[PDB]
Amino acid sequence: MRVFPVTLGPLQENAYLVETGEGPVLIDPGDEPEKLLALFQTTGLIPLAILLTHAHFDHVGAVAPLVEALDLPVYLHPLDLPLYEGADLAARAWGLAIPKPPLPVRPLEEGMRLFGFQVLHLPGHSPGHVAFYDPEGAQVFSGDLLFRGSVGRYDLPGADPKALFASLKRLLSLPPETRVHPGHGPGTTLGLEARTNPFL
Ligand SMILES: [Zn+2]
Ligand SMILES: [Zn+2]
Ligand SMILES: [Zn+2]
Ligand SMILES: [Zn+2]
Ligand SMILES: [Zn+2]
Ligand SMILES: [Zn+2]
Ligand SMILES: [Zn+2]
Ligand SMILES: [Zn+2]
């Protein structure tokens, strides 16, 4: 896999354009569709699908224009559908404008394999929060579960603090060399966080 991260929107969310053995995918296009469209150009990669770790508005704000332009299927765990459906309203409450994310979506599920990833259902930050795990490349796109020196907020819509810490226990049982590509902030590894994260 070749991995192209881009930070997007006022909430500084990380999208990932990833070349897989089954073609390119785009993970969490949160905002600034022009910036994503420009990334397609400089990399020469056109995503075949949108994959969503979860449906907080900062992760889905660029879904609509990209689906309109490229007819991209959108993969989301069904437990985050209520978040997905009202994402523009949630953004609006903070005074932020995004287009309403388009329906329908294609489902994700614990144990599913797609585009070279294994889907881990890891709720807590949101009910349908997943990670996309690539054991062969030793890497995980774990959304807002685990950050460099912190963990996902558990005070947001759909949050479940006890689910979160159970999910983190699950995540930290993967190989320590596993590279983490999170929804916010810099990349890390599971081993580094095992040594330094104050929540672990
Ligand atoms: Zn790779
Ligand atoms: Zn925007
Ligand atoms: Zn989130
Ligand atoms: Zn179309
Ligand atoms: Zn496949
Ligand atoms: Zn589950
Ligand atoms: Zn619960
Ligand atoms: Zn986020």
CATH class of 1-200: alpha beta
Our CA angle for 38, 19, 131, nearest 5°, is 105
How many angstroms is it from 166 CA to the middle of ligand 2?
33
How many angstroms is it from 73 CA to the middle of ligand 4?
11
Rounded distance, CA 93 to CA 86, Å? 11
Plot region of 128 (φ>0 → left; ψ -120 to 50 → alpha; else → beta):
alpha
Binding-site members for Fe(3+) are 54, 56, 58-59, 125, 144, 184
What resolution, expressed in A, was reported for this entry?
Answer: 2.2
How many angstroms is it from 95 CA to the middle of ligand 1?
38
Q: Where are the domains of the chain?
A: 1-200
- Secondary structure of residue 83 in the 3-state scheme: helix
- For 11, 38, 57, 133, the CA distances from 35, given in Å and listed in that order, are 15, 5, 17, 26
**Ligand approaching nearest to the C-alpha of 115:** 5
